[PDB]
Symmetry: D2
Subunit: 493 residues, 4 copies
């Protein structure tokens, strides 16, 4: 009932949601429509850090709130780039599409997030190749079709067939195979760098999880994403328009990847968190033959096969832990007993950690053979117990800056104050001699399933002996856990 | 050996091995699967926190407060045994919570089993007993200087209050009265439970905490008050104490009684009610229990957590269709529609006996408006919320004792007018929310007319949006104009 | 080119080059040498923050609020020029503050020059004029679309209110009324100045902020209210608005009116008074001014900051001995002694005309106690503190307009009883603090007897520690017992 | 008036102070007595970060509040060590002494903290050798004697002559010259590691300033000192009792020194902060002949000579900046004009940054010769302006982990879970290949005092040419600021 320039004013109030990390943020009605579906709401029942909650009691946060944050930040970054550079022709349609991809990027996560595709599926179905990101595309497709989203998209200026395709590309990368993307052209290349940056890992996903995980873990975040946004521009790089950082921010960019690595070190790869994920996975494996999840047209699926049917997969969340824990079926006894051990805190025992020494790298094809190697070590110590291959767990952890051996800053372009449209490169030695010399390494953790004092003492001797035999690094507590073993190795002394 | 645990609220804290032994049981670990704020998570996406981490915090703060009091006043004879007992009570105070915390004993049980009288605190005693017995805790207690018979009893008293119908406690004597004020303070509500949840809930909700518990601890002493030794606050902290209860009230207002959070709890409860006949939880000796009867068997109750929401949601049993359909409406965000809020005006108070009759009153209002729809009693929900400073009509500060700088052993009282004229003049009130289960535009417009008419008829306060939602109704009431 | 600056409160914020040009002047940079909370730093060691950083924050938030309103409502015709003008007013609002901020115009000037009538806001207009003229800002303003004559006038109006004795503003018309509510809101006190100082002062003080300004911005709109376009709050935010003023009051209570902070301000002011005849500040054309007369010359006033405390402290001039000795007492922490606090009881209000006569009243009280010491009027300090919600006796929420979800263009009013019965029943009160300049045990004991006797005689409230500090006095008053 | 076991109870209420960093903390009356003196209160008028406030508007904090924090944390750490290990025989006297040293460690700072002893004194009086820590001893002595503290110390169980000596040793290190300390013996060696740790830099001073500076700067702290305290013990190391860290905290210790370095990088060595300190120092130098500070017995001192008289030095704070700024004396015109340039933000112009390349290190004896080298470079660029030695400032910044070239973790001892009384060493390669390979480097900043566009463009050409001539690293913006210069160097391309 109000008019301006002779035309009626229309008031479209956005939904406002209060997030502890980002504060009060506005959700466009199209995002709301996507959020309020069983497919998206599912993420409320999947813990961001999986078993981490069993080590960090503040880490009760789920994928849901993280996904909201990623959608929000994606919008924030695209908007800012567009406000500073109208010449990029960023439309509200483009903004929505990037927001949606941010929201939906984690739709394919299973129970306990990275445990599911990182540990469980590879063991439960070695023939398949599965990733949560592929799952996110399938789940996104299912969300769209089951909830009649296409008309709603059209209503807000989206072109579904193109934009749905674009969204999927933002999530999983190129869907085929020159410029490998179809949803958007080279001059909007920078749009593909926002949610999931496959080129250098600088994206808003990190920005949310740094801040969110820190808030819940009780570890403090030292990366400033708002600063980064202020010092980001889009410049021409080899015929694409790409996000570039202000040159003097290079220190802060190295620090961003240092933060990521510290979080993996302190929290995500916590030695006990990992053994809890291991044990949960063992329980799932022992339960997989007996639990039934009903999918499309009444078909029955297993935990390991629910990934093949999005209707079933929709019902596959952290709930499965409790279904197992609370079960009475005798056939689930073995699974159930593992989870009960978790509850009584009768966990597999951490033996130690070591690393390879040279340019030596442990191949994934050889992971399975490692426990046997440990059991076959011959420590010159008098022991009450003999341990077998099956008593040992050997967990190999790849720690890196997100691109294996590569320095991600070598794949970043910068701009200078005096020529803010000119992209440049900055090399490592131009920056600082105090930076890492390598960008990838492996940590090897060894655990023992025999938890008594005598078995643990024995396991330590086998472990350190194995380290010596393989020319691995001297464990940090080596002289304490295995004083009779460490002298033999003079490379260690 | 003790353990160090990192909590986001309290930082790195130490857990005595006896506490670890109690924590690492199915009975305690259960609290990982029960959301602190229940349906609140469906309005505040940061509110994913569970009772578990809150219980750790309460146990920690209980220890902190007892230790500080003991360090400053050796004459109180606070032993490490005393410290452990208070820590255990802090840890175990919430053991009796059910699915979605206060939804369970606040909404579900009263509807599902009106004959019984159940509280989470009673549940905590039963669950604590079950925890002790099922996990062989008594020997461990003895190993660390506790005397189980006495101390178990003491712990239960700290949780639920006096265990019988003059000093009413057996676990500890009058000269350690102050130990009963730490976990759950029945006298004035100043306890460490609040201190943890203020800070924790604020951290997760994205609302800032304005109470400083560490300051309070520095300005706390134990003084003689009528043959008891009681916690007393420094006199000049009286302002900050009023602010503590103001903070509590603001958190209820903004978050815990959020109009949508409450309707989600309502809907979840409806789903539980429609599921209760069909879900089976196996308890002691294979006996079968229902959601509503699991409170009678701690073995079954151990397996009754927020999981039940998802068991219902993921079920295929045709008998669970109705329950399942309510939860699906939650997921699609097809929620009951908020109509409005009002309050009583005078000394008038709505009795709980009459809550059930209210939707009928609303449906029977006769708005002088032409409507396309007629609504019935069953289309309305009337949610009556009691908001207070923790002791009904009473000012809790009237039950606080203070000490002065010049005589720190002398307990005194401070009255309200000695403090500030800007403080509340009353300490309890009721909020009345009305919702409609018919969600279409026409029904909602009708519901608004019935509601405002009802407010007028009952001499309740004018709804804030009254002139907008019911312009034809508001003029009739000149007390409103 | 614009600049990015990192503020701990607001993070990385952008400064338009015109704001930079204004910031980088001696007149603005001056604010780096004036503590926000004055003597507060001597009680709260984190409160080292200056007016400078606060002014940056206010300028930033002013821009934020105007921008948000404009983005949601293009029909308001908010221009970048308008944004700049509001930002400048935010930046420059505190230009007129003197040494130790509110101590200067609150305590010093009224004592040093009782004939004049001076406020920091008037000072800000004069200093703003001086800043513009001395730094050739007008051409720069023009370069960025401002119209100096009009916009300078507008800026001054935003700072000090209407510049004359019906729409009383010239800088902008009724349809941009809302622009005058942003920096300094004379109508209801809801402005961005509060928003910055809540957050900033809390950060430095070590007291937590419980107001959410970002939420407020999301629930703010501009609606027609009597031919003006005014900022309106969403109706359901009324609770949060009351809490905003509660927060203000708690900060005054805990920090800004801290009994020791105030006595430090008092003592500093005494030192300034004893120094005023002897310190020389060179102003325009070499003319000499005093601390008390520097307000008459902006060139001199530019050089009048917290530095004056240290000029006095470090001086050797025998004529400054008395001033210097007061500051040394501050350093040795030989402060005047706090005796107690009381309040008036009825509708009774202490007039400012009578403040000067109060120490004499205290000295003339006749306590029925045998004392070793007789105290005189000059041994007592009586500090009367007006505590209110910003508009004397008035409820500021009565001067707020709201909008409802179903009609977001329609401004409405909400009354107090429509909200909550737990809110204040009055919005102003007075606190009376009494101190003694005689610091020995015997004098202090005597002062307490005089004070409590005086409270009894005047029918003031019973001091909180009354029975402890003056046990022989309190029984006489049975209104107290 | 209350009794227990027949004896009167005495209630000694400590003063409580609210600090934003540490919260409500208790001050022992002896600390209060020391705090409430002109010598200590002086620290309220000296900014922690000096010129930093002119770049970071939140950095208004003074040495005073930092000193309170250090005193508090010193007490916290000593108390915790003593609570866990009664066998160390830590007394309340020991606690007080460490608290006092923490409080008083910064008493010797001058105007703008590190500017004074880092920049001003070395220029104003090159013959002398002065450090703030030496100043802190002298000021501490003056504080004690002028305020009659010795009797108060005795009253609380201190033995002044021994303990005063001990306090001074904690502040400045050994006062002479085997075990080089006299205040306490080898079995309380760990007490010397608390306030100022000369062996490996792990002390409570860092812990306070990390947290405090971060709070004011608007940069977030990522070090957790409370965690460290929980994982700290005292163990026998080469006949001393020394503070040892839990072995698995080694990652977090490396991160502690990384945090320190990031703070220097982002904030303390900010290129503009440093030029402001430079300019302030220039102003002091031009004022030094004309400002008079009255010391003991009416004697007159200068800014540069006030360090010789503690009574004068007591009156030498950040106030001197404003005395200069507000002065009218024609003789102070030149000083005053520099400060006015600061206020108008007419600052010397940043030209660029480079580093040495090899194991090459720029000697301090050669710093003075550098501007001349820059001015003598011969860029093959056509310029409107010729610049001289005096137009250039060359600021050489030593960035390191606190012990020059050394890895501080090589001077840390650790303990293991299974043997918490046994000290061990952990080497760099036992930890991680992603850590720094070097622990020290130099940054070379160049500035120009001629601020016009033409002079600045010229300065850039001289600078980059100089970098090329010296085989220094290619400036990050080199191709942008000096495109005609960079091609000549093929080591750069
Ligand atoms: O005082 C409050 C009230 C709500 N919230 C949160 C809860 C939620 O995440 C967001 C939106 O809540 P609000 O109550 O504003 O939304 P609503 O219930 O959808 O209200 P309406 O639909 O009437 O606008 O703000 C707060 O942080 N503070
Ligand atoms: O890593 C940093 C660097 C600077 N600052 C702060 C200091 C200041 O308040 C704001 C701007 O600093 P910056 O160094 O980006 O500005 P500049 O020195 O003016 O750089 P240039 O003029 O080269 O853009 O950011 C940070 O918070 N973090
Ligand atoms: O509500 C308050 C009051 C004071 N303070 C701070 C100021 C100071 O840093 C510390 C101590 O202040 P308090 O008012 O308790 O001390 P006092 O004035 O010395 O009171 P008294 O001497 O009566 O104990 O607490 C707060 O943080 N909150
Ligand atoms: Mg809503
Ligand atoms: Mg462990
Ligand atoms: Mg700059
Ligand atoms: Mg005091």
């Amino acid at each position: 009932n109000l008019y301006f320039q002779g035309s009626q004013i229309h008031v479209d109030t956005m939904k406002v949601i209060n997030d502890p990390i980002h504060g009060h943020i506005e959700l466009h009605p199209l995002l709301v429509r996507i959020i309020d579906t069983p497919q998206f709401q599912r993420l409320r029942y999947i813990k961001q850090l999986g078993g981490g909650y069993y080590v960090f009691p503040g880490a009760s946060h789920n994928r849901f709130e993280h996904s909201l944050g990623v959608g929000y930040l994606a919008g924030c970054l695209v908007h800012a780039l567009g406000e500073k550079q109208p010449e990029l022709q960023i439309s509200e349609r483009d903004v929505l599409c990037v927001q949606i991809a941010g929201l939906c990027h984690d739709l394919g996560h299973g129970p306990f997030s990275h445990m599911f595709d990182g540990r469980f599926i590879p063991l439960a179905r070695p023939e398949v190749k599965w990733t949560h990101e592929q799952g996110s595309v399938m789940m996104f497709e299912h969300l769209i079709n089951s909830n009649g989203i296409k008309p709603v998209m059209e209503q807000y200026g989206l072109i579904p067939e193109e934009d749905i395709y674009f969204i999927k590309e933002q999530i999983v990368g190129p869907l085929e195979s020159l410029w490998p993307y179809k949803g958007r052209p080279e001059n909007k290349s920078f749009l593909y760098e926002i949610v999931s940056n496959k080129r250098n890992g600088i994206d808003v996903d990190k920005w949310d999880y740094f801040a969110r995980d820190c808030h819940h873990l009780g570890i403090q975040n030292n990366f400033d994403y708002k600063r980064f946004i202020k010092f980001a521009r889009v410049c021409e790089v080899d015929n694409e328009l790409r996000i570039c950082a202000r040159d003097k921010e290079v220190g802060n960019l190295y620090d961003m990847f240092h933060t990521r690595n510290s979080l993996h070190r302190r929290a995500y790869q916590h030695k006990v968190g990992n053994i809890i994920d291991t044990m949960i996975t063992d329980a799932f494996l022992k339960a997989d033959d007996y639990i039934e999840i009903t999918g499309a047209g009444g078909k029955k699926y297993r935990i390991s096969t629910a990934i093949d049917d999005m209707e079933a997969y929709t019902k596959l969340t952290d709930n499965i832990f409790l279904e197992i824990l609370y079960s009475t079926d005798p056939k689930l006894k073995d699974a159930r007993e593992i989870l009960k051990q978790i509850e009584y805190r009768n966990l597999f025992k951490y033996v130690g950690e070591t690393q390879p020494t040279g340019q030596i790298k442990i191949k994934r094809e050889d992971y399975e053979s490692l426990p046997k190697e440990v059991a076959s070590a011959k420590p010159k110590v008098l022991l009450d117990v003999k341990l077998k291959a099956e008593d040992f767990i050997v967990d190999v952890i790849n720690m890196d800056y997100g691109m294996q051996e590569k320095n991600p800053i070598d794949h970043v372009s910068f701009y200078c104050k005096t020529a803010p449209n000119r992209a440049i490169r900055i090399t490592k030695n131009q920056v600082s001699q105090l930076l890492p010399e390598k960008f990838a390494e492996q940590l090897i953790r060894v655990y023992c399933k025999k938890v008594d004092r005598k078995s643990l003492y024995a396991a330590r001797q086998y472990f350190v002996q194995w380290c010596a035999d393989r020319n691995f690094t001297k464990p940090q507590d080596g002289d304490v856990i295995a004083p009779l073993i460490t002298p033999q190795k003079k490379e260690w002394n």
